[PDB]
Amino acid sequence: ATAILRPIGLHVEKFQQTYRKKWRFLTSANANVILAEAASGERPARWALTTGMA
Amino acid sequence: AMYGYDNDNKDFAKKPPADATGAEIYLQDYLTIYTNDARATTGTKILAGFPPYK
Q1: Contacts of A47 in chain B (CB under 8 A)
Q2: How far apart, in Å, are the Cα atoms of A37 and each of A4, A9, A40, A50?
Q3: Whether B13 contacts A35, CB under 8 Å
Q4: Across the strands, what pairs with A37?
Q5: Nearest by CB to A36, which of B13, B16, B20?
Q6: Spatial distance between the Cα atoms of A17 and B17, rounded to a whole number of angstroms
Q7: A40 φ, ψ to 5°?
Q8: Residue B12 phi/psi, 5° resolution?
Q9: What CA–CA distance (Å, rounded) separates A32 from B11?
Q10: Sign of CA dihedral B3, A36, B26, B35
Q11: CA-CA distance, B8 to A29, in Å (whole number)?
Q12: Angle at Cα A34 formed by Cα B27 and Cα A37, nearest 5°?
């Protein structure tokens, strides 16, 4: 029995794209210093310890 | 210097915890050799000087 028609489904077309970038970053070596942050609104007063990793 | 102050201390911002930051800690206690001071000694004197600690 020859099949003139078959369930070929929908004609769905799928596209793929890729994006490449190269960046150069300069980061300073900050000291580890304790800074006082005042309370404001919902934020309570807290001590802050900075770190040099960007 | 190693473990910081308590959060309620006023000097809390002075010394951040080294155990948390990974910073260094200047050592200030050094070895000292001793010998007798014979200038004020009356009678017999010991004039041996310093031992060769090197």
Answers
A1: 7, 12-13
A2: 77, 62, 9, 12
A3: yes
A4: A46
A5: B13
A6: 48
A7: -150, 115
A8: -65, -30
A9: 16
A10: negative
A11: 29
A12: 165
DSSP A43: B
Method: cryo-EM
Q: A-chain residues within 8 Å CB-CB of B16?
A: 32-34, 49
How is chain A split among helix, strand and coil, in percent rounded to 5?
A: 0, 20, 80
Helix (H, G, I), strand (E, B) or coil at A35: strand
Secondary structure element (H or E) that encloses residue B19, with its range: helix B18-21
Rounded Cα distance between A29 and B23, Å, is 13
Residue A6 one-letter amino acid: R
Asked if B36 reaches chain A (Cβ–Cβ under 8 Å), the answer is no
